[PDB]
Design a protein around this nucleic acid. Sequence first.
RNA 1: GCUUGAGUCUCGUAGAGGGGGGUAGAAUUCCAGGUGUAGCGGUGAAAUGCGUAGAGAUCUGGAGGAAUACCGGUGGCGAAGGCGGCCCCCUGGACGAAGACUGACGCUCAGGUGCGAAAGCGUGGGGAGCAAACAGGAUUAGAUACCCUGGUAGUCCACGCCGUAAACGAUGUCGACUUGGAGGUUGUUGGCUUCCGGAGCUAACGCGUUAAGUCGACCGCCUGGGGAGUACGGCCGCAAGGUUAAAACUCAAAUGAAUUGACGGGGGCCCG
RNA 2: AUGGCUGUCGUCAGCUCGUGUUGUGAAAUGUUGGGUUAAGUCCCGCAACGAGCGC
Lengths: 117, 88, 69, 54
Amino acid sequence: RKQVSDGVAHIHASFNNTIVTITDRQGNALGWATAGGSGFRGSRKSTPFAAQVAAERCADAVKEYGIKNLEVMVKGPGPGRESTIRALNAAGFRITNITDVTPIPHXGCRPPKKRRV
Amino acid sequence: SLSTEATAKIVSEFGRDANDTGSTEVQVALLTAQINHLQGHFAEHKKDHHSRRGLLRMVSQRRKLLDYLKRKDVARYTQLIERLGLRR
Amino acid sequence: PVIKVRENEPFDVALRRFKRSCEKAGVLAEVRRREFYEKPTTERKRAKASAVKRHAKKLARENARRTRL
Amino acid sequence: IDYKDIATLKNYITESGKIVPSRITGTRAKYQRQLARAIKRARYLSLLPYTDRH
RNA sequence: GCUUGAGUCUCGUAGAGGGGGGUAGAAUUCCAGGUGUAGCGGUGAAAUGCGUAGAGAUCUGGAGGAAUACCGGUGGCGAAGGCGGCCCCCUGGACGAAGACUGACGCUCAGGUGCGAAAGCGUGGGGAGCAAACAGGAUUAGAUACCCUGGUAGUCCACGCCGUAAACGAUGUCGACUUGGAGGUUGUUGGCUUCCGGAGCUAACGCGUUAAGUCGACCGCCUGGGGAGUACGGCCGCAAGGUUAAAACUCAAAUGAAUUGACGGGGGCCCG
RNA sequence: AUGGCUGUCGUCAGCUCGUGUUGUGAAAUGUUGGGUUAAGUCCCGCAACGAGCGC
Ligand SMILES: CN[C@H]1C[C@@H](N)[C@H](O)[C@@H](O[C@@H]2O[C@H](CO)[C@H](O)[C@@H]3O[C@]4(O[C@H]23)O[C@H]([C@@H](N)CO)[C@H](O)[C@H](O)[C@H]4O)[C@@H]1O
Ligand SMILES: CN[C@H]1C[C@@H](N)[C@H](O)[C@@H](O[C@@H]2O[C@H](CO)[C@H](O)[C@@H]3O[C@]4(O[C@H]23)O[C@H]([C@@H](N)CO)[C@H](O)[C@H](O)[C@H]4O)[C@@H]1O
Ligand SMILES: [K+]
Ligand SMILES: [K+]
Ligand SMILES: [K+]
Ligand SMILES: [K+]
Ligand SMILES: [K+]
Ligand SMILES: [K+]
Ligand SMILES: [K+]
Ligand SMILES: [K+]
Ligand SMILES: [Mg+2]
Ligand SMILES: [Mg+2]
Ligand SMILES: [Mg+2]
Ligand SMILES: [Mg+2]
Ligand SMILES: [Mg+2]
Ligand SMILES: [Mg+2]
Ligand SMILES: [Mg+2]
Ligand SMILES: [Mg+2]
Ligand SMILES: [Mg+2]
Ligand SMILES: [Mg+2]
Ligand SMILES: [Mg+2]
Ligand SMILES: [Mg+2]
Ligand SMILES: [Mg+2]
Ligand SMILES: [Mg+2]
Ligand SMILES: [Mg+2]
Ligand SMILES: [Mg+2]
Ligand SMILES: [Mg+2]
Ligand SMILES: [Mg+2]
């Protein structure tokens, strides 16, 4: 309803899944979509193409608002890193900013044990 | 470690000269001073094992120098252990 | 990696510039190494392996110049 | 190196704020260690950033 | 007696050497909400699990513990075990320079004593993350596993105990001597260190001035494979156990290195 | 027990030897290597130099 002209696409690109959330600059969510809930499960869910649709659907979630320009915040090592950003650019957003906000401990906590297969 | 001035006092007192840094008197006196100084350290810092190895070397070196001086000059030995207040 | 897209800057340039800055900071390398715990014995083992092969690359590479096939 | 000498120390950090290797900059080992200390002191005093995020 | 071994003094140098006290930033988890809405999470594929009581995501603030990205290096320091953010306090050793000084004060060391990773044990704390045990979900002929979701000791701190590890360079300590080459690190030609290689040595593999070469001193240890580093006794330990350490019996081998094949759910390159 | 004859890997590009050299030795080298061919086919390099059976 309240026309927000400027927002942030937060891309949580994990190895298994991609979550796109658009916020305002203060970080209040407008609308989200995910690869998992776009007709892609398992092998399909963890593709650039499944993240591609999640980007598209998240644009057509936030169309109530008139976001002119999206800053972009990318988080994680997944295959929805780049495919999400291109898809948002081809939803008619002006990408002013791309930022990697992938969290990196400066040491931090002991990670889980290595998988034996 | 023992300071320049604290060192130089001991060299003057136990030496034949301030240049007589080498004598067994001076060496034993300087070891005794640091051994006694470090008893304060190891009272607080009981698990400082790495430093304590250095103390035990000083103790060992002093023992060796006293045994040398005993069998060389028994008179000087007796004076030394009395002045420094050592048992043997 | 924190691109600020410039005045009249095209998208692929900024994106490829984000790609280059990400590969530079070594982000995806660091997420992968921190995914699972590597024991110090394993870390030292692979660090020695990298050291050995690197030096051993040269001894064979710098015996390749003055050798005919 | 001097932790206060910010213009110098910025020659030895990346855009992300990370200390640049000696292999890259051609710094001698002795000075890389002194440089590392100076940057870490500067980061404490908030004259340099730890990271480009913050 | 002497000064060449060994040591003392003077000046400087590098260092994750040790002990104590502070503190910083990143991240994880949790709590409190703000926004927001149907998924999240996970795998080979799943499912258990979490989620409309609003998760996941995102923003703000708070709490708490543990570890210090980059620097970082066949880099450094330490007797070995080991030691890594930054700051202070206390403290050990090493190296170099140029003298002065002591005058063989040395080397090794059974017994003895001390130190000694991780796990473990005791008492009191602490507990984010991780995780033996355990539970559930899978996989499978079965699956007391590997994989998944959780998760308690424990991992952290203080003090005490334990005294062992492929505690390894599988190479005792000290000293002398004996062609070279390329590096690293640290001093003002020395110290430490990595790789290659000569003679020599070696069963071979290899080692090669940091020797496994050539010698000397002293110590420790071995005597076929099993039985057995076990039993019994002693000593030590709160316990777990450690340490010292047999015998009968049994076999004609066990073993090391290297060679040729074959084979690999090893690699590379090709063909039908 | 055998001779002869035959299947099979497969008409796949292999399999060997003399002499020399290397190793205490089993053995190795040649036959590996760079290119190339349907081919151990050929050229080039090479402690190998030649040779046979295959091709
Ligand atoms: C060199 N100085 C050390 C002196 C010790 N007395 C400290 O206990 C130690 O600190 C501890 O370090 C370990 C790592 O070895 C953990 O990091 C602990 O968690 C710490 O430090 C804790 O706890 C502290 C608190 N206990 C308050 O002092 C602060 O929160 C610190 O930021 C936090 O890292 C310091 O580093
Ligand atoms: C007869 N005394 C010397 C005994 C040696 N075993 C010392 O290593 C040496 O010590 C060194 O002295 C020089 C000067 O000749 C510097 O001062 C070094 O810096 C020191 O001493 C260092 O390093 C020490 C560290 N090595 C830790 O103990 C401490 O930081 C001291 O405060 C600091 O003076 C003493 O002087
Ligand atoms: K700390
Ligand atoms: K010192
Ligand atoms: K003795
Ligand atoms: K726990
Ligand atoms: K011995
Ligand atoms: K026997
Ligand atoms: K041989
Ligand atoms: K031959
Ligand atoms: Mg996992
Ligand atoms: Mg210190
Ligand atoms: Mg422990
Ligand atoms: Mg305990
Ligand atoms: Mg877990
Ligand atoms: Mg598990
Ligand atoms: Mg303590
Ligand atoms: Mg043992
Ligand atoms: Mg070890
Ligand atoms: Mg080892
Ligand atoms: Mg041994
Ligand atoms: Mg060699
Ligand atoms: Mg026993
Ligand atoms: Mg016993
Ligand atoms: Mg011969
Ligand atoms: Mg052949
Ligand atoms: Mg032919
Ligand atoms: Mg040939």
